[PDB]
Design a protein around this motif. Structure first.
Motif, PDB file in Angstrom:
ATOM      1  N   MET A   1       0.734  -1.221  -0.131  1.00  0.00           N
ATOM      2  CA  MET A   1       0.010  -0.014   0.048  1.00  0.00           C
ATOM      3  C   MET A   1       0.732   1.249   0.090  1.00  0.00           C
ATOM      4  N   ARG A   2       0.367   2.309  -0.805  1.00  0.00           N
ATOM      5  CA  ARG A   2       0.934   3.593  -0.820  1.00  0.00           C
ATOM      6  C   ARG A   2      -0.072   4.550  -1.336  1.00  0.00           C
ATOM      7  N   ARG A   3       0.527   5.950  -0.785  1.00  0.00           N
ATOM      8  CA  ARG A   3      -0.442   7.039  -1.088  1.00  0.00           C
ATOM      9  C   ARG A   3      -0.245   7.657  -2.321  1.00  0.00           C
TER      10      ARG A   3
ATOM     11  N   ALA B   1      -7.951   0.408  -3.620  1.00  0.00           N
ATOM     12  CA  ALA B   1      -7.956   1.802  -3.039  1.00  0.00           C
ATOM     13  C   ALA B   1      -8.841   2.140  -1.690  1.00  0.00           C
ATOM     14  N   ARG B   2      -7.882   2.792  -0.896  1.00  0.00           N
ATOM     15  CA  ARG B   2      -8.703   3.218   0.484  1.00  0.00           C
ATOM     16  C   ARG B   2      -8.795   4.612   0.215  1.00  0.00           C
TER      17      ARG B   2
ATOM     18  N   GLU C   1      -4.870   5.392  -0.694  1.00  0.00           N
ATOM     19  CA  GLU C   1      -3.847   4.752  -0.357  1.00  0.00           C
ATOM     20  C   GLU C   1      -4.088   3.260  -1.122  1.00  0.00           C
ATOM     21  N   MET C   2      -3.458   2.938  -2.013  1.00  0.00           N
ATOM     22  CA  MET C   2      -3.718   1.774  -2.550  1.00  0.00           C
ATOM     23  C   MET C   2      -2.253   1.073  -3.105  1.00  0.00           C
ATOM     24  N   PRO C   3      -2.291  -0.137  -3.426  1.00  0.00           N
ATOM     25  CA  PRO C   3      -1.211  -1.081  -3.944  1.00  0.00           C
ATOM     26  C   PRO C   3      -0.810  -0.650  -5.129  1.00  0.00           C
TER      27      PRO C   3
END
Ligand SMILES: [Mg+2]
Lengths: 93, 93
Positions: B1-3, B35-36, B66-68
């Motif tokens: 996960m990354r922003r 995605a969050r 925030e998603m992969p």
């Protein structure tokens, strides 16, 4: 006079004092082209994930101004030929 | 996960209910790709003054998520093939 948002992507390798100088020089250029600087912001170091492109990293600088439409293209070219400026996007609000 | 910050330019001719639908569908697509969704914003109708381009008008949609990383390119293509989507810019914060 019209309102614009001037988007600037600067070289990601600039140190803070260089970032500051460029930000100040660019703000002066704006005024030099008749701009009334209403807002200014350094939005940090960012990386373009999409679309795919070379030199994806950069400092995002943003200005909101009111300036004459006739000087918009000139200011843009002025900013673009600056070596630390990698991208210039001017949007009319 | 990354922003990431997902930038979207939508057809300027959409009426408000169409704008809303697209905004909701795009948000779902985001989640569909893991995605969050942390933030979402419709920044209005804007016109690209520079650089010079065709179809300068558009609604600016913005999402912070925030998603992969592995699903970023896929989500981008998914959004790009949508007819009302004219531009997709995904920036890694
Ligand atoms: Mg903001």
């Amino acid at each position: 006079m019209r309102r614009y948002e001037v988007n600037i992507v600067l070289n990601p390798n600039l140190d803070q004092s260089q970032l500051a100088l460029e930000k100040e020089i660019i703000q002066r250029a704006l005024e030099n082209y008749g701009a009334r600087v209403e807002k200014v912001a350094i939005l940090g170091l960012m990386v373009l994930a999409y679309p795919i492109a070379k030199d994806p990293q950069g400092y995002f600088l943003w200005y909101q101004v009111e300036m004459p439409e006739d000087r918009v293209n000139d200011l843009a070219r002025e900013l673009r030929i600056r070596d630390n400026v990698r991208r210039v996007m001017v949007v009319k609000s």
